[PDB]
Amino acid sequence: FLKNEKDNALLSAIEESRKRTFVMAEEYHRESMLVEW
Amino acid sequence: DNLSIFESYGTALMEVVCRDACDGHDIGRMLALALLDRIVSVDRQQQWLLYLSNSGYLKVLVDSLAEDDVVLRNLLTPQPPLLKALYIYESKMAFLTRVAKSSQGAIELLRSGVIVRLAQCQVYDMRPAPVERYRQILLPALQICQLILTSSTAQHLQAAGQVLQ
Amino acid sequence: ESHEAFNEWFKHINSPPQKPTLVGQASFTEKVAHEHKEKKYEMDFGIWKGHLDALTS
Amino acid sequence: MFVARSIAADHKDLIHDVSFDFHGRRMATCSSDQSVKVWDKSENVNWHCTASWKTHSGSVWRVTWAHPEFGQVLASCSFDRTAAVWEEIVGGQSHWVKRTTLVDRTSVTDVKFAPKHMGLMLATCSADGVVRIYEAPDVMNLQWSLQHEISCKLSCSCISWNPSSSRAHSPMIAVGSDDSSPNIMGKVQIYEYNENTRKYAKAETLMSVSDPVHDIAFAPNLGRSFHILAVATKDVRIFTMKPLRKELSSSGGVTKFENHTVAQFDNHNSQVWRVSWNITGTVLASSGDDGTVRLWKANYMDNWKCIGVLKGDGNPVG
Amino acid sequence: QQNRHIGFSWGPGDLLLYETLYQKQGNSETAARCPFMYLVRSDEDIYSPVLRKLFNESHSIFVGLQKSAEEASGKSRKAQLVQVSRNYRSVLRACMEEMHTLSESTRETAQKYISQISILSAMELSWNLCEILFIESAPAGPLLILLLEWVRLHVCEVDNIVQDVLRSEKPTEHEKFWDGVTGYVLQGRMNEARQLLAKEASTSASARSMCRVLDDLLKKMPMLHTGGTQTLTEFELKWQHWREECERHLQNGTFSSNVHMEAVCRVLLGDEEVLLEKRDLMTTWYHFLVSRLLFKHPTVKPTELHFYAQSSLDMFLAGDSCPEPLDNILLAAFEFDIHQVIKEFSIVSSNWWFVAHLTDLLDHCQLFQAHNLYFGANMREFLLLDYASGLFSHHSLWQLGVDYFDYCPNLGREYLKLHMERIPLSTEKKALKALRICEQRQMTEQVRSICKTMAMQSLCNRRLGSALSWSIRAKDAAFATLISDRFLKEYCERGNFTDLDLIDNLGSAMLLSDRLTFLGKYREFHRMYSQEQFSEAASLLLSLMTARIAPCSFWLTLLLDALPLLEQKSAEQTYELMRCLEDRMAAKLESTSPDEIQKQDSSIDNTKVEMLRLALARNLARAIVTEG
Amino acid sequence: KFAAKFVSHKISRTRWRPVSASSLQQPDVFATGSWDNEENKVCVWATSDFGATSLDEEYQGDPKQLCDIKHPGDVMDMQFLDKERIVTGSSTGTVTIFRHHENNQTLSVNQRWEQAHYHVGSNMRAPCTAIVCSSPEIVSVGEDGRINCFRAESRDVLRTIDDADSSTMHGVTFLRTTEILTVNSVGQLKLWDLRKQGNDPTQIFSVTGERVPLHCVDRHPNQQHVVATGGQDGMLCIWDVRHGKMPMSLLNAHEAEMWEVHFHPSNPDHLFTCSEDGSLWHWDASADSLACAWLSTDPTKGQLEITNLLPSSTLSVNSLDVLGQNLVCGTDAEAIYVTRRLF
């Protein structure tokens, strides 16, 4: 399953980009809520 | 302690990583921007942020946004040549959004003319998947603007003037 | 100081000049090159021995 | 903006030739007055006659310098059927001394020293249709041994050694053929030295040169995988010669050639008499019956063009 | 002349031309004398002293650039390239200034000096246009600021007019006063125009009210700034509003009592008729272009410049005037056709300098398609090879051409080999410089040629020591043997060696040839003889004779030495010497001619041999006694 | 530190005009010889404008050519004989005295020896490779292996040492009023007594086992036994001509041929060297402060400080000269470099 492992590596990279988007987007929403408060 | 280690190397490691995040190639740029995004978030001292600004890397990253107008025009097509550009753009906008969360960062972004450069971009006037994509462009651009200015200091009111423009 | 002098002496005594060896079918040019190597060796050995006697003292 | 400055040669008879030495510091002139003169260039860029002697009793057709590694050596050839080798015996007592006379049946029409890496060799050609190659066995004793006779089967008018020092090319000679030959074409022939037979063998015949050939010149190869040959006839012709491919298993032939006419120029307006390459093989000079010397050069697209024309009064054409 | 054929001969960089004769035999009535020397040279202006200085300074610049091309990225690299471009232009400036002082002080060369100043003007003009464009490539906004600065740097006539007006006792009564005001407005110099208008506001009360309106219009004029946060759209709106203010003042007849103030207000509106009426203040169609861009199209895009440039040329030249070759160059630059800019300059320029350095700088900007031309090399290597080849024609500049050829390994190494072998070696200092250059670039055959040439020159000069030193450096074993044989002619004749100290110090170089080996070993034998090491000397001589390193006449010589040695007051050693003598004698019977066989020493040799036999016999008996 | 003047000729030699020891005036005038051109020249130059009395303006002054004269051949070597007279050796084997007329800013030929250097038997001219002056005496050496002695007022050669060397001599210096040192293409330093009636050197010095050409030689001004030489290998050799036949010190100086070596005339703890590699080095032996610092065989006593004075990437620096606070050098880059503030 060497090809599967390579695919998994690509998947992990995509997951890292997704986590970055998750963190920054959540922070922006929190900042907007704080400004409204 | 991690930040002390980043500092300990000197402005040498910070310069090499920030330069490569700017104009390397595809994956590496995306990952380098993500890394910068993450390091600047844990930058309580905001030294990395100061280095990026003093060395001109922050300006280069902002100037490079004007690059995507042609990419967006090509992308509004039914078939997309490569989503790699979209991921770089996201990492870049994420990193900039992180820098904008800082009270100082918002000021530095305003000094660098980020709102002026966004106002020059014609991609925002091409409202059509393609509609969803126009939507996402709008998302990142407007994101940065609003979040920044709002979480921005009371003294920087012109923020409101530039956004209105 | 005595241990340093001994270590300098011990390094120098273990690095004698190599006596040139003649390979048994040397060309005329290689025999002249050997005589030049042997004269060089006698000179280098004289210097090495003079330095060894100074370090020994 | 080329500038030409006249000198009072005061020749007894018009000199039919001028040859520079390899360094362009000396020149030799020859005349109907039966003499050769040698001229040295002073630091002030003035020419001074340093030797003058009567050389022959026949039309000196050609003169050539040896490579300076063999000393100050000249060869001349003549209507008297001989070639002569001359050495500049200086004391300020220069007096170009005749070292030998090569006497092997008709007018010797051209004479050329071989490329220096082949030793002190001299080729002659004659109207008998033979090329003769001589070698001086001792460079200190300018005795000459006849090494080769090459039967061209046509009157020889001119010869050119291939100047290539590449060990991948056998020694080569181009020869011409003045004969008007209403029919026989092939008036340029190429001979290659064959190591297996220890003889020159005919490698090529430029069948497109059905016109009488007055002069020929191989271009300096300068790392090209192909040779370039200029030919003076009724027109200026330029040939590329590509050697064919090969197998290391066995080989004993002249390795046949692919020949292309890359230029033909009738712009001479008269039987082009001479062709000469500059030292880089990038500019060709030609002369013809139109009383002009023309300069030819390729651009970066390999398109050859003329780049200068002259007058009888000596002024360059506007 | 009289239908004469032209003979030619190629020199290393010169073409010799002569009248051959006629190929007709003594013929042709038309009589005279062919006393004509015709050296055709390619190239001419290179000889200028100032241009040579330029070339040296810029070789320094080139080497610097090549070396630093590994060290810098994106923006920093772009700025470095801009600065290199500016340095080239500053060198151009200095050169022009020097040429101008020269023309001023020297009337006979001033015609030519002014021609060359104009040539350098051409050069700096083209270089700078190309630079600005490709290298800076400024976007909508900064472009017009740089074009106003470009016109100001190259069109100086307005400042001369204003200086003359200001030197007058009453500047406002001066004929050219309004030409100075209008010229500053046409150049975008609103503050300087306002300073002149402030003088006119002092003259009259009616002029003062109109001058205040015009001063306010000039003061309010929107200008683009290299660093403002202002968008091009916000600028365009302010500019339109300011233009409507100018138009309202004109329509109200505000300036109707002063034709010059009305004309300035029409210029501020971009009135093309009034701009063309003022052509004599602009002097060039490209100044007129930039003034039109300032007052009609202040946000012009790079892609639209060609349309306005062509329209400005056509309007400015709308009589019997044809475009100059410079206009075609500038139009091609405004079209963004770099190939046409290079082509037009290659036709107009005598020298490849402009096109070579501009194309090199634009190649570093990553513009040309990145491929080889038609011979395993690109536009840059081709032009550098031809330029460097041009420098090799000149007696002092050929050294600079070497470093240009090092630039590209493929396209400058074989040419460098060929040219290095052709250098006239008149002095040892010049040869040592050429050798240092070759050794660094690994050229063995060329160096061998150099050394052999030097040593043969020394054989001709009778400097045997210098010739030998050069032959040893050549490894030239053949030439080594030649010089050994010359020394042998000399010693067969005088009974002593010339230059003893050199032979005594040959060391390992003695092995370069067998003949040299023999010479050195024999000199060692003579040294042993002077040191009374008699046995050693004799044995060395015997070994040399048996090895047959000696030439077959030194056999006689060395045999006579063995003669007295034997004569003095082991058995195997004695037998050996006998064998050597017999071998020598057999060789003589064969190789030595009958004439040379018949000489005097035969009887002397036989007595020496009998003495040797007697000493060996007794010596053998002594050896047997020792063994006992 | 250096003003650079581009001059459309390669510069083979540069020399300062000698100042009187009683003058408080800094050296201001120098001469240059050119080589490797169709027409070579001797030029005289000034560093100061004759008239600037401000002690406080930064010297940005380019050297100004005062006058020139055509020189047949390539100026192989050049020395001032005195304030008015310049001596040259030519590639034509001619030795020439030029007179400088300061009032008229002109050079004129004062005297020449057209057959100073020539090969015996062919009468072919041989290059005059080096000259040394000690007014009124002049010594020359050449590729013909000859040593000639002249006096400036004598039309005849006072003495020739024929066949003095079987190799090209490259450099000559005065050891003492009647003694000279020469260097040659076989790596020998030779001592000569100009009163000895024979043609043999008094002494011969050489590096053992190596035959590297020596190009230059200079004598320490105050210590008549200390000599510096330079070779084709770029090595700086220091000699005590009283001690042995070998150098006292061998110093790695340059990556290519060393063209000139000079001790500082008034502060001989400084030495200067120039090379084909384009470098110009200042050597300082004072940095640890009568044992000559140059003769120190103790690598722990006398740290030599070494400084390259020119920018990286000059072409060959063919000549240098140093007088007080001033240094001039000439190059193959068609350039003269001048400093007036060396220290």
Author numbering:
A (entry chain O): 101 to 137
B (entry chain A): 1464 to 1591, 1610 to 1646
C (entry chain M): 746 to 802
D (entry chain D): 1 to 91, 99 to 111, 113 to 150, 152 to 327
E (entry chain B): 18 to 586, 591 to 649
F (entry chain C): 4 to 292, 321 to 374
Question: What does the publication say?
Answer:
The structurally resolved NR subunit contains 22 molecules of 12 distinct nucleoporins, one molecule each for Nup205/Nup93 and two molecules each for the other 10 nucleoporins. Each Y complex comprises a short arm (Nup85, Nup43, and Seh1), a long arm (Nup160, Nup37, and ELYS), and a stem (Sec13, Nup96, Nup107, and Nup133). In our structure, the N-terminal β-propeller of inner ELYS stacks against the N-terminal β-propeller of inner Nup160; the α-helical domain of inner ELYS aligns with the α-helical domain of inner Nup160, orienting the AT-hook domain into the nucleoplasm. Through close interactions with Nup160 and Nup37, ELYS becomes an integral component of the long arm of the Y complex in the NR subunit. Notably, inner ELYS from one NR subunit also bridges interaction with an adjacent NR subunit. Nup93 connects the stems of inner and outer Y complexes within the same NR subunit, and places its N-terminal extended helix into the axial groove of Nup205 from the neighboring subunit.
Nuclear pore complex (NPC) constitutes the only regular route of cargo transport between the cytoplasm and the nucleus.
